[PDB]
Design a protein around this motif. Structure first.
Motif, PDB file in Angstrom:
ATOM      1  N   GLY D  73     -30.592   2.147 104.073  1.00 57.56           N
ATOM      2  CA  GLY D  73     -29.901   2.346 105.619  1.00 57.56           C
ATOM      3  C   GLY D  73     -28.595   1.511 105.600  1.00 57.56           C
ATOM      4  N   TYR D  74     -27.937   1.260 104.631  1.00 60.46           N
ATOM      5  CA  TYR D  74     -26.892   0.326 104.585  1.00 60.46           C
ATOM      6  C   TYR D  74     -25.549   1.155 104.230  1.00 60.46           C
ATOM      7  CZ  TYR D  74     -29.938  -3.447 104.977  1.00 60.46           C
ATOM      8  OH  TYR D  74     -31.157  -4.280 105.567  1.00 60.46           O
ATOM      9  N   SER D  75     -24.268   1.021 104.984  1.00 60.23           N
ATOM     10  CA  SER D  75     -23.329   1.289 104.625  1.00 60.23           C
ATOM     11  C   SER D  75     -22.472   0.570 103.691  1.00 60.23           C
ATOM     12  CB  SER D  75     -22.129   1.641 106.045  1.00 60.23           C
ATOM     13  OG  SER D  75     -22.883   2.502 106.887  1.00 60.23           O
ATOM     14  N   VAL D  76     -22.315   0.878 102.377  1.00 58.40           N
ATOM     15  CA  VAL D  76     -21.981   0.104 101.363  1.00 58.40           C
ATOM     16  C   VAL D  76     -20.460   0.017 101.145  1.00 58.40           C
ATOM     17  CG1 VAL D  76     -22.712  -0.470  98.933  1.00 58.40           C
ATOM     18  CG2 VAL D  76     -24.208   0.704 100.039  1.00 58.40           C
ATOM     19  N   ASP D  77     -19.812  -1.274 101.059  1.00 54.37           N
ATOM     20  CA  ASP D  77     -18.496  -1.551 100.643  1.00 54.37           C
ATOM     21  C   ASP D  77     -18.697  -2.211  99.339  1.00 54.37           C
ATOM     22  OD1 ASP D  77     -15.906  -2.855 102.849  1.00 54.37           O
ATOM     23  OD2 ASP D  77     -15.971  -1.815 100.895  1.00 54.37           O
ATOM     24  N   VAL D  78     -17.656  -1.567  98.381  1.00 51.99           N
ATOM     25  CA  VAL D  78     -17.900  -1.764  96.800  1.00 51.99           C
ATOM     26  C   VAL D  78     -16.426  -2.340  96.720  1.00 51.99           C
ATOM     27  CG1 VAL D  78     -18.231  -1.258  94.541  1.00 51.99           C
ATOM     28  CG2 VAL D  78     -19.612   0.040  96.468  1.00 51.99           C
ATOM     29  N   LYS D  79     -16.283  -3.638  96.060  1.00 50.73           N
ATOM     30  CA  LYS D  79     -15.037  -4.153  95.640  1.00 50.73           C
ATOM     31  C   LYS D  79     -15.165  -4.612  94.228  1.00 50.73           C
ATOM     32  CE  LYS D  79     -12.729  -3.874  99.376  1.00 50.73           C
ATOM     33  NZ  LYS D  79     -13.503  -2.931 100.407  1.00 50.73           N
ATOM     34  N   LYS D  80     -14.140  -4.426  93.505  1.00 50.65           N
ATOM     35  CA  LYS D  80     -14.169  -4.315  91.941  1.00 50.65           C
ATOM     36  C   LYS D  80     -13.230  -5.286  91.522  1.00 50.65           C
ATOM     37  CE  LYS D  80     -14.500  -0.089  90.797  1.00 50.65           C
ATOM     38  NZ  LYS D  80     -14.459   0.859  90.008  1.00 50.65           N
ATOM     39  N   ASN D  81     -13.347  -6.133  90.457  1.00 53.71           N
ATOM     40  CA  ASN D  81     -12.489  -6.824  89.553  1.00 53.71           C
ATOM     41  C   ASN D  81     -11.652  -7.957  90.453  1.00 53.71           C
ATOM     42  OD1 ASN D  81     -13.317  -5.599  87.314  1.00 53.71           O
ATOM     43  ND2 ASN D  81     -12.038  -3.700  87.983  1.00 53.71           N
ATOM     44  N   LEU D  82     -12.225  -8.953  91.196  1.00 57.11           N
ATOM     45  CA  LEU D  82     -11.800  -9.850  91.951  1.00 57.11           C
ATOM     46  C   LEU D  82     -11.724 -11.237  91.459  1.00 57.11           C
ATOM     47  CD1 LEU D  82     -13.231  -8.755  95.408  1.00 57.11           C
ATOM     48  CD2 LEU D  82     -11.006  -7.972  94.682  1.00 57.11           C
ATOM     49  N   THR D  83     -10.745 -11.887  91.930  1.00 59.57           N
ATOM     50  CA  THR D  83     -10.612 -13.334  91.907  1.00 59.57           C
ATOM     51  C   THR D  83     -11.574 -14.316  92.658  1.00 59.57           C
ATOM     52  OG1 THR D  83      -8.614 -13.726  93.244  1.00 59.57           O
ATOM     53  CG2 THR D  83      -8.394 -13.126  90.916  1.00 59.57           C
ATOM     54  N   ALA D  84     -11.975 -15.505  92.462  1.00 57.98           N
ATOM     55  CA  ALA D  84     -12.804 -16.297  93.320  1.00 57.98           C
ATOM     56  C   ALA D  84     -12.040 -16.263  94.861  1.00 57.98           C
ATOM     57  CB  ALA D  84     -12.934 -17.697  92.745  1.00 57.98           C
ATOM     58  N   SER D  85     -10.752 -16.568  94.875  1.00 58.87           N
ATOM     59  CA  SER D  85      -9.984 -16.502  95.899  1.00 58.87           C
ATOM     60  C   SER D  85     -10.097 -15.041  96.780  1.00 58.87           C
ATOM     61  CB  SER D  85      -8.412 -16.646  95.578  1.00 58.87           C
ATOM     62  OG  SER D  85      -7.715 -16.836  96.748  1.00 58.87           O
ATOM     63  N   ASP D  86      -9.933 -13.800  95.863  1.00 57.76           N
ATOM     64  CA  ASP D  86     -10.221 -12.625  96.474  1.00 57.76           C
ATOM     65  C   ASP D  86     -11.422 -12.235  97.042  1.00 57.76           C
ATOM     66  OD1 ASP D  86      -7.678 -11.785  96.121  1.00 57.76           O
ATOM     67  OD2 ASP D  86      -8.119 -10.686  94.223  1.00 57.76           O
TER      68      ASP D  86
END
Lengths: 173, 88, 88, 173
Positions: D73-86
Motif C-alpha cells: 500500500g505504499y507509493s514508492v519513490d525510487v532514486k538512483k546513483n546518489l552521493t551521501a550529500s544527495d
C-alpha cells in the motif's frame, strides 16, 4: 509463593510450556535439563568513580538484577568499580568459563555512567577517557572468542546515558 | 571435519535509552530502566519471549515526563524466540 | 499547550549482515537478503508483525555456506507490534 | 490471484484481522482507513559508481522492493546513483512530504556498496570517502526533523556490506 528459588517471578506451568511448543514450531531456543545445566550471568556495576559523580542507588540495581537472574536459574557473578581494561579482562574470563559448555544461554548486565561512545570505567574523565564500547562486548562473547555459547542466546543489558540530551521534543496538542 | 558457523549470532542488547540521550536513576529507588525491566521480567517471563518483554518495557516508557527515556533494543541476531520457561 | 514527545521512537532498521561482515549479491538473481526479505514479507505479512518476519528472515540464513551472512535488526524503538494487514 | 494491487503478497482476511486484535490488546500500531491514507516509501539504490565495481543485478532488487512496497500500500519513490550529500538532501525532502500527515507508517530502503562506517555514495573511494551513516538516517526521520511520522512505524532496510569479513568461523562436528 516467593519462598522458592524463583522468588517474585511468575512461574510457567507444564500446561503453558507445552502450549508454547504448539503455538510456534521448531523456532524456540532449546533449554537444557534443569538437573544438569550450569547457567552463568555476569553483572558489572560501577558506583564509585574517580572523577565523575557517585552513582547513589546502584546497590538497589545490583540487588534487583542479581535476585532476578538467580530466579531465572543463573549463577550470578558480580563485579564492581572496574576500568574499561578491567571490564575487558573480566569479560574474557567470563567467556572462558567451562560452565557455558553445559549452559543453554547467558545474561550480561552493565551498569555505569555513559557517553555516546560507550560505557564509563572507574577512571573515566573528559581529559583521559576510560570507555568500554558495546562493540567490544559483542566481540568478546561471539562464536570466535566464546565458542561455548555458539547457537545459545546472549542477552546484554546496559544501564547508562548514551549522551547529554534529554531525549524529548515539543509538540502542540 | 570442520564446519562453518556464523561469527555473530543469537545476540540481543537492551539499552536504557536511545543514542545521544540520557537515562535516569533515582538515588534511593535505583535506575528506572532496571526496575522496569525486573518488574516486566517477573510478570512476563512465563508467557512471553525476551524480545516481546523488551517491547513491553519500551511501551511502558511511551508517555514522557520531566525525566523521559526510551529503551532501545540493539544488534539483534536471535534467530528463534527466547523463552525463559521460569520454574523449568 | 505544548506537550513532550520522545525524540526517537517507533523505528526499526534491518541490515543485510552483522557489523564487520559482507553481504552477498547475485549478479543476475539480485541481493540474497533483499530476495529473502521479499519472499518472507509476501508469505508472512498477513499473519506476523514485521519484527517477527525479520526474525524469520534471520532464521533462514542460519545454515552457513560458501557465502554466509546474518541479517541484523538494529536500533529498535517500536513500542507496539507492527502488522501490515495486507488487503486492508 | 496476483492480478490485484497486492500482487504476490498473501492477504490478511477479515477473520484474521480481528483475531490479531483479540490475541494482543491495545499494543498494535493503528492503521488508517484505506480510502483516505497516503502511505509513502523511498528506495535509494546505487548501482553506477565512480571508483567501486558496478552493482550488477541491482535492477532486480529495485523491481522486487518497488513491487513489494506497492503491494503493501505504499507509493514508492525510487532514486538512483546518489552521493551521501544527495542522499541526505533526498531524505530531508522525504521527511517534508505532506502525505506523511495522512499516512500511518513508512518504509525506507537503502541499497549500495558499504563499509563498517556506513553506506557508500556514488563518488566513494578509499582516498575520498562518500559515506552516509545510519545514524543520519534515523536523525532525519525522527520526531524532531519529521514530526509528521510521530508515533508511526518507520522501517529501514539496508542492503550493503558492513566490512570486509566473510562473517564465519570454523568448528569441528
Amino acid at each position: 509463593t516467593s519462598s522458592g528459588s524463583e522468588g517474585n517471578v511468575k512461574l510457567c506451568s507444564l500446561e503453558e510450556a507445552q502450549r508454547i511448543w504448539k503455538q510456534k514450531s521448531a523456532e524456540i531456543y532449546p533449554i537444557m535439563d534443569k538437573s544438569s545445566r550450569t547457567r552463568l550471568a555476569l553483572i558489572i556495576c560501577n558506583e564509585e568513580f574517580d572523577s565523575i559523580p557517585r552513582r547513589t542507588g546502584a546497590e538497589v540495581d545490583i540487588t534487583g538484577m542479581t535476585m532476578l537472574l538467580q530466579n531465572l536459574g543463573y549463577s550470578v557473578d558480580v563485579k564492581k568499580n572496574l576500568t574499561a581494561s578491567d571490564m575487558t579482562t573480566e569479560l574474557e574470563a567470563f567467556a572462558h568459563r567451562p560452565e557455558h559448555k553445559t549452559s543453554d544461554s547467558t545474561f550480561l548486565v552493565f551498569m555505569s555512567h555513559g557517553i555516546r561512545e560507550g560505557i564509563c570505567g572507574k577512571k573515566h574523565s573528559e581529559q583521559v577517557p576510560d570507555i568500554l564500547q558495546l562493540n567490544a562486548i559483542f566481540n568478546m562473547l561471539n562464536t570466535k572468542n566464546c565458542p561455548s555459547l555458539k547457537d545459545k542466546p546472549k542477552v546484554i543489558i546496559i544501564q547508562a546515558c548514551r549522551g547529554d540530551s534529554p531525549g524529548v521534543v515539543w509538540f502542540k496538542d | 571435519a570442520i564446519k562453518k558457523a556464523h561469527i555473530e549470532k543469537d545476540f540481543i542488547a537492551f539499552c536504557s535509552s536511545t543514542p545521544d540521550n540520557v537515562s535516569w536513576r533515582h538515588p534511593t529507588m535505583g535506575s528506572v530502566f532496571i526496575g522496569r525491566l525486573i518488574e516486566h521480567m517477573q510478570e512476563y517471563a512465563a508467557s512471553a519471549d525476551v524480545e516481546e518483554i523488551f517491547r513491553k518495557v519500551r511501551f511502558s516508557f511511551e508517555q514522557p515526563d520531566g525525566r523521559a527515556q526510551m529503551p532501545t533494543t540493539e544488534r539483534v541476531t536471535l534467530t528463534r524466540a527466547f523463552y525463559l520457561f521460569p520454574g523449568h
